[PDB]
PDB file of C-alpha atoms in Angstrom:
ATOM      1  CA  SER A   2     -43.369 -39.388  75.597  1.00  0.00           C
ATOM      2  CA  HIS A   3     -46.458 -37.482  74.442  1.00  0.00           C
ATOM      3  CA  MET A   4     -46.034 -33.716  74.077  1.00  0.00           C
ATOM      4  CA  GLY A   5     -49.455 -32.415  73.090  1.00  0.00           C
ATOM      5  CA  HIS A   6     -50.472 -28.865  72.241  1.00  0.00           C
ATOM      6  CA  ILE A   7     -53.622 -26.747  72.325  1.00  0.00           C
ATOM      7  CA  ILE A   8     -53.520 -24.781  69.081  1.00  0.00           C
ATOM      8  CA  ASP A   9     -55.792 -22.090  67.676  1.00  0.00           C
ATOM      9  CA  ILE A  10     -55.845 -21.792  63.882  1.00  0.00           C
ATOM     10  CA  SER A  11     -57.439 -19.783  61.079  1.00  0.00           C
ATOM     11  CA  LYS A  12     -57.047 -19.585  57.305  1.00  0.00           C
ATOM     12  CA  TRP A  13     -53.667 -17.943  57.893  1.00  0.00           C
ATOM     13  CA  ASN A  14     -52.265 -21.364  58.805  1.00  0.00           C
ATOM     14  CA  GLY A  15     -52.903 -22.563  55.259  1.00  0.00           C
ATOM     15  CA  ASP A  16     -53.059 -26.241  54.390  1.00  0.00           C
ATOM     16  CA  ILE A  17     -52.184 -28.588  57.240  1.00  0.00           C
ATOM     17  CA  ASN A  18     -50.636 -32.068  57.222  1.00  0.00           C
ATOM     18  CA  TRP A  19     -53.080 -33.537  59.739  1.00  0.00           C
ATOM     19  CA  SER A  20     -51.598 -37.044  59.701  1.00  0.00           C
ATOM     20  CA  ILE A  21     -48.271 -35.660  60.919  1.00  0.00           C
ATOM     21  CA  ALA A  22     -49.704 -33.015  63.259  1.00  0.00           C
ATOM     22  CA  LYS A  23     -52.029 -35.507  64.981  1.00  0.00           C
ATOM     23  CA  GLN A  24     -49.557 -36.792  67.587  1.00  0.00           C
ATOM     24  CA  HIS A  25     -48.740 -33.195  68.564  1.00  0.00           C
ATOM     25  CA  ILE A  26     -52.358 -32.068  68.954  1.00  0.00           C
ATOM     26  CA  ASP A  27     -54.453 -32.279  72.113  1.00  0.00           C
ATOM     27  CA  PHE A  28     -57.096 -29.737  71.060  1.00  0.00           C
ATOM     28  CA  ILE A  29     -57.757 -27.248  68.245  1.00  0.00           C
ATOM     29  CA  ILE A  30     -59.825 -24.052  68.278  1.00  0.00           C
ATOM     30  CA  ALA A  31     -60.485 -22.862  64.711  1.00  0.00           C
ATOM     31  CA  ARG A  32     -61.749 -19.553  63.363  1.00  0.00           C
ATOM     32  CA  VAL A  33     -65.230 -19.604  61.846  1.00  0.00           C
ATOM     33  CA  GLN A  34     -65.586 -15.930  60.963  1.00  0.00           C
ATOM     34  CA  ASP A  35     -64.104 -12.462  61.316  1.00  0.00           C
ATOM     35  CA  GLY A  36     -67.233 -10.572  62.264  1.00  0.00           C
ATOM     36  CA  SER A  37     -70.481 -11.197  60.400  1.00  0.00           C
ATOM     37  CA  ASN A  38     -68.981 -10.063  57.102  1.00  0.00           C
ATOM     38  CA  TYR A  39     -66.096 -12.488  56.618  1.00  0.00           C
ATOM     39  CA  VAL A  40     -66.379 -16.274  56.522  1.00  0.00           C
ATOM     40  CA  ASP A  41     -63.075 -18.055  57.167  1.00  0.00           C
ATOM     41  CA  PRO A  42     -62.395 -19.930  53.876  1.00  0.00           C
ATOM     42  CA  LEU A  43     -60.427 -22.863  55.309  1.00  0.00           C
ATOM     43  CA  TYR A  44     -62.544 -23.596  58.390  1.00  0.00           C
ATOM     44  CA  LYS A  45     -64.874 -26.138  56.760  1.00  0.00           C
ATOM     45  CA  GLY A  46     -61.961 -28.050  55.263  1.00  0.00           C
ATOM     46  CA  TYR A  47     -60.168 -28.045  58.608  1.00  0.00           C
ATOM     47  CA  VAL A  48     -63.216 -29.467  60.368  1.00  0.00           C
ATOM     48  CA  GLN A  49     -63.688 -32.209  57.779  1.00  0.00           C
ATOM     49  CA  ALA A  50     -60.043 -33.215  58.232  1.00  0.00           C
ATOM     50  CA  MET A  51     -60.106 -33.059  62.026  1.00  0.00           C
ATOM     51  CA  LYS A  52     -63.203 -35.271  62.181  1.00  0.00           C
ATOM     52  CA  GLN A  53     -61.590 -37.765  59.807  1.00  0.00           C
ATOM     53  CA  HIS A  54     -58.466 -37.835  61.983  1.00  0.00           C
ATOM     54  CA  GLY A  55     -60.349 -37.986  65.287  1.00  0.00           C
ATOM     55  CA  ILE A  56     -59.085 -34.598  66.469  1.00  0.00           C
ATOM     56  CA  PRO A  57     -61.302 -32.722  68.975  1.00  0.00           C
ATOM     57  CA  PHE A  58     -61.933 -29.047  68.273  1.00  0.00           C
ATOM     58  CA  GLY A  59     -63.731 -25.868  69.229  1.00  0.00           C
ATOM     59  CA  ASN A  60     -64.811 -22.738  67.325  1.00  0.00           C
ATOM     60  CA  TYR A  61     -63.889 -19.076  67.711  1.00  0.00           C
ATOM     61  CA  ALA A  62     -65.146 -15.913  66.048  1.00  0.00           C
ATOM     62  CA  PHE A  63     -63.464 -12.523  65.937  1.00  0.00           C
ATOM     63  CA  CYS A  64     -66.048 -10.055  67.247  1.00  0.00           C
ATOM     64  CA  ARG A  65     -66.954  -6.900  65.339  1.00  0.00           C
ATOM     65  CA  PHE A  66     -70.449  -6.104  66.603  1.00  0.00           C
ATOM     66  CA  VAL A  67     -71.478  -2.439  66.756  1.00  0.00           C
ATOM     67  CA  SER A  68     -74.547  -2.691  68.994  1.00  0.00           C
ATOM     68  CA  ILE A  69     -76.466  -5.132  71.183  1.00  0.00           C
ATOM     69  CA  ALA A  70     -78.734  -6.137  68.297  1.00  0.00           C
ATOM     70  CA  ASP A  71     -75.748  -6.492  65.980  1.00  0.00           C
ATOM     71  CA  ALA A  72     -73.989  -8.673  68.569  1.00  0.00           C
ATOM     72  CA  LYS A  73     -76.919 -11.089  68.561  1.00  0.00           C
ATOM     73  CA  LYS A  74     -76.707 -11.162  64.759  1.00  0.00           C
ATOM     74  CA  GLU A  75     -72.974 -11.918  64.803  1.00  0.00           C
ATOM     75  CA  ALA A  76     -73.643 -14.755  67.259  1.00  0.00           C
ATOM     76  CA  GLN A  77     -76.351 -16.149  64.984  1.00  0.00           C
ATOM     77  CA  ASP A  78     -73.974 -16.040  62.003  1.00  0.00           C
ATOM     78  CA  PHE A  79     -71.260 -17.698  64.115  1.00  0.00           C
ATOM     79  CA  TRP A  80     -73.595 -20.500  65.211  1.00  0.00           C
ATOM     80  CA  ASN A  81     -74.953 -21.122  61.718  1.00  0.00           C
ATOM     81  CA  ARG A  82     -71.503 -21.150  60.095  1.00  0.00           C
ATOM     82  CA  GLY A  83     -69.788 -23.202  62.777  1.00  0.00           C
ATOM     83  CA  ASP A  84     -69.691 -26.981  62.847  1.00  0.00           C
ATOM     84  CA  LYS A  85     -71.892 -28.346  65.618  1.00  0.00           C
ATOM     85  CA  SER A  86     -69.307 -30.982  66.575  1.00  0.00           C
ATOM     86  CA  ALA A  87     -67.289 -28.217  68.244  1.00  0.00           C
ATOM     87  CA  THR A  88     -66.962 -28.706  72.006  1.00  0.00           C
ATOM     88  CA  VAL A  89     -66.670 -24.976  72.756  1.00  0.00           C
ATOM     89  CA  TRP A  90     -67.566 -21.643  71.121  1.00  0.00           C
ATOM     90  CA  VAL A  91     -65.419 -18.562  71.731  1.00  0.00           C
ATOM     91  CA  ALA A  92     -66.043 -14.814  71.479  1.00  0.00           C
ATOM     92  CA  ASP A  93     -62.701 -13.353  70.338  1.00  0.00           C
ATOM     93  CA  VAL A  94     -62.529  -9.723  71.491  1.00  0.00           C
ATOM     94  CA  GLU A  95     -59.516  -7.673  70.377  1.00  0.00           C
ATOM     95  CA  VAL A  96     -60.798  -4.348  69.002  1.00  0.00           C
ATOM     96  CA  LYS A  97     -63.333  -1.763  70.151  1.00  0.00           C
ATOM     97  CA  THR A  98     -66.312  -1.868  67.784  1.00  0.00           C
ATOM     98  CA  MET A  99     -68.839  -0.329  70.182  1.00  0.00           C
ATOM     99  CA  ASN A 100     -68.535   1.762  73.350  1.00  0.00           C
ATOM    100  CA  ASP A 101     -69.861  -0.938  75.678  1.00  0.00           C
ATOM    101  CA  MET A 102     -67.897  -4.009  74.602  1.00  0.00           C
ATOM    102  CA  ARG A 103     -68.819  -5.880  77.765  1.00  0.00           C
ATOM    103  CA  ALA A 104     -72.543  -5.500  77.009  1.00  0.00           C
ATOM    104  CA  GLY A 105     -72.091  -6.482  73.369  1.00  0.00           C
ATOM    105  CA  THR A 106     -69.965  -9.466  74.323  1.00  0.00           C
ATOM    106  CA  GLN A 107     -72.534 -10.665  76.853  1.00  0.00           C
ATOM    107  CA  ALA A 108     -75.300 -10.316  74.252  1.00  0.00           C
ATOM    108  CA  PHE A 109     -73.185 -12.362  71.814  1.00  0.00           C
ATOM    109  CA  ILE A 110     -72.471 -15.045  74.423  1.00  0.00           C
ATOM    110  CA  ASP A 111     -76.064 -15.205  75.691  1.00  0.00           C
ATOM    111  CA  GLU A 112     -77.341 -15.645  72.136  1.00  0.00           C
ATOM    112  CA  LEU A 113     -75.002 -18.607  71.661  1.00  0.00           C
ATOM    113  CA  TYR A 114     -76.419 -20.182  74.826  1.00  0.00           C
ATOM    114  CA  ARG A 115     -79.955 -19.484  73.586  1.00  0.00           C
ATOM    115  CA  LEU A 116     -79.190 -21.189  70.268  1.00  0.00           C
ATOM    116  CA  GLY A 117     -77.851 -24.311  71.955  1.00  0.00           C
ATOM    117  CA  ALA A 118     -74.154 -23.838  72.722  1.00  0.00           C
ATOM    118  CA  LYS A 119     -73.290 -25.567  76.005  1.00  0.00           C
ATOM    119  CA  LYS A 120     -69.702 -24.394  76.572  1.00  0.00           C
ATOM    120  CA  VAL A 121     -68.889 -20.791  75.675  1.00  0.00           C
ATOM    121  CA  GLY A 122     -65.642 -18.939  76.280  1.00  0.00           C
ATOM    122  CA  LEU A 123     -64.063 -15.521  75.871  1.00  0.00           C
ATOM    123  CA  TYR A 124     -60.690 -14.462  74.451  1.00  0.00           C
ATOM    124  CA  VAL A 125     -59.560 -10.919  75.332  1.00  0.00           C
ATOM    125  CA  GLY A 126     -56.618  -9.274  73.593  1.00  0.00           C
ATOM    126  CA  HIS A 127     -54.314  -6.656  75.074  1.00  0.00           C
ATOM    127  CA  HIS A 128     -55.757  -3.255  75.992  1.00  0.00           C
ATOM    128  CA  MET A 129     -59.342  -4.529  75.962  1.00  0.00           C
ATOM    129  CA  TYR A 130     -59.804  -6.113  79.392  1.00  0.00           C
ATOM    130  CA  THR A 131     -59.744  -3.235  81.881  1.00  0.00           C
ATOM    131  CA  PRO A 132     -61.045  -0.384  79.683  1.00  0.00           C
ATOM    132  CA  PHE A 133     -64.270  -2.312  79.084  1.00  0.00           C
ATOM    133  CA  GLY A 134     -64.511  -4.244  82.346  1.00  0.00           C
ATOM    134  CA  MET A 135     -64.335  -7.632  80.647  1.00  0.00           C
ATOM    135  CA  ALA A 136     -63.915  -9.307  84.038  1.00  0.00           C
ATOM    136  CA  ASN A 137     -67.685  -8.867  84.299  1.00  0.00           C
ATOM    137  CA  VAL A 138     -68.488 -11.034  81.298  1.00  0.00           C
ATOM    138  CA  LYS A 139     -70.156 -14.304  82.279  1.00  0.00           C
ATOM    139  CA  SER A 140     -68.912 -17.353  80.380  1.00  0.00           C
ATOM    140  CA  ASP A 141     -67.606 -20.852  81.043  1.00  0.00           C
ATOM    141  CA  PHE A 142     -63.953 -19.973  80.523  1.00  0.00           C
ATOM    142  CA  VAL A 143     -61.526 -17.145  79.786  1.00  0.00           C
ATOM    143  CA  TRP A 144     -58.597 -17.204  77.353  1.00  0.00           C
ATOM    144  CA  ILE A 145     -55.898 -14.519  77.438  1.00  0.00           C
ATOM    145  CA  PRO A 146     -52.543 -13.964  75.703  1.00  0.00           C
ATOM    146  CA  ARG A 147     -49.124 -12.932  77.020  1.00  0.00           C
ATOM    147  CA  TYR A 148     -46.021 -13.902  75.077  1.00  0.00           C
ATOM    148  CA  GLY A 149     -43.327 -12.776  77.514  1.00  0.00           C
ATOM    149  CA  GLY A 150     -42.866 -15.799  79.763  1.00  0.00           C
ATOM    150  CA  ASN A 151     -45.081 -14.445  82.532  1.00  0.00           C
ATOM    151  CA  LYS A 152     -48.753 -15.400  82.803  1.00  0.00           C
ATOM    152  CA  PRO A 153     -51.623 -13.044  81.884  1.00  0.00           C
ATOM    153  CA  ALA A 154     -52.408 -10.146  84.231  1.00  0.00           C
ATOM    154  CA  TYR A 155     -55.883 -11.541  84.872  1.00  0.00           C
ATOM    155  CA  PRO A 156     -57.164 -14.969  85.890  1.00  0.00           C
ATOM    156  CA  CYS A 157     -57.843 -17.246  82.930  1.00  0.00           C
ATOM    157  CA  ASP A 158     -58.310 -20.883  81.991  1.00  0.00           C
ATOM    158  CA  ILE A 159     -56.358 -20.846  78.742  1.00  0.00           C
ATOM    159  CA  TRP A 160     -53.098 -18.935  78.374  1.00  0.00           C
ATOM    160  CA  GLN A 161     -51.956 -18.184  74.825  1.00  0.00           C
ATOM    161  CA  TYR A 162     -48.248 -18.105  75.603  1.00  0.00           C
ATOM    162  CA  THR A 163     -46.825 -17.650  72.121  1.00  0.00           C
ATOM    163  CA  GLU A 164     -47.736 -16.653  68.583  1.00  0.00           C
ATOM    164  CA  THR A 165     -44.458 -18.052  67.250  1.00  0.00           C
ATOM    165  CA  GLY A 166     -44.714 -21.715  68.150  1.00  0.00           C
ATOM    166  CA  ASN A 167     -43.978 -24.375  65.552  1.00  0.00           C
ATOM    167  CA  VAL A 168     -45.739 -27.715  65.205  1.00  0.00           C
ATOM    168  CA  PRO A 169     -44.982 -30.433  62.618  1.00  0.00           C
ATOM    169  CA  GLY A 170     -47.454 -30.278  59.742  1.00  0.00           C
ATOM    170  CA  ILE A 171     -48.717 -26.841  60.791  1.00  0.00           C
ATOM    171  CA  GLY A 172     -45.709 -24.537  60.850  1.00  0.00           C
ATOM    172  CA  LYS A 173     -45.924 -21.240  62.737  1.00  0.00           C
ATOM    173  CA  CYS A 174     -48.822 -21.159  65.178  1.00  0.00           C
ATOM    174  CA  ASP A 175     -50.388 -19.872  68.400  1.00  0.00           C
ATOM    175  CA  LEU A 176     -49.836 -22.240  71.341  1.00  0.00           C
ATOM    176  CA  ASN A 177     -51.901 -22.413  74.530  1.00  0.00           C
ATOM    177  CA  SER A 178     -51.669 -23.890  78.020  1.00  0.00           C
ATOM    178  CA  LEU A 179     -54.260 -24.575  80.716  1.00  0.00           C
ATOM    179  CA  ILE A 180     -53.822 -22.587  83.926  1.00  0.00           C
ATOM    180  CA  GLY A 181     -57.359 -22.349  85.296  1.00  0.00           C
ATOM    181  CA  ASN A 182     -59.908 -24.828  86.644  1.00  0.00           C
ATOM    182  CA  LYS A 183     -60.782 -26.450  83.310  1.00  0.00           C
ATOM    183  CA  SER A 184     -58.907 -29.666  82.492  1.00  0.00           C
ATOM    184  CA  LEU A 185     -57.959 -30.855  79.014  1.00  0.00           C
ATOM    185  CA  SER A 186     -60.784 -33.411  79.152  1.00  0.00           C
ATOM    186  CA  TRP A 187     -63.277 -30.594  79.754  1.00  0.00           C
ATOM    187  CA  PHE A 188     -62.359 -29.251  76.311  1.00  0.00           C
ATOM    188  CA  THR A 189     -61.831 -32.485  74.369  1.00  0.00           C
ATOM    189  CA  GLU A 190     -64.800 -34.364  75.845  1.00  0.00           C
TER     190      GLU A 190
END
């Protein structure tokens, strides 16, 4: 009986035994950068391995833009550094880097669309949604965390339900479930 998982990873996950993890993976979303100034050092290796193992994946970037113009720049860096085989591109918003985070996030997302991204999503960490009115961001899907057994306080398509999951070949990791109107096939293509 298949028991697949939607896992987000970054260099913090270290080296992964992809041959063993394969059967437990439905989809992966990997970190490309932490703002414009930090390139994730394991991302490229992860992508090479996932392609070799036939594992579908998406890209995410932690956002650190300080203005509208800077947001467009971060998006450009994200696009250029990310592998184009990704099925989705995600703006990962967890800290206030500018007063109008909703405007910066939309600029970031719109620039990705302008560059060629066809499926763009948004991840919003705790204490960022309401203060900045993130419900007003326009994207293809929303991804929100809540590790207490109850679903996120806002509608979303991907629910990050734990940051202490464990998957063979990967170890400790963030696990996600689909609770919106986007099916697994929409992400894996």
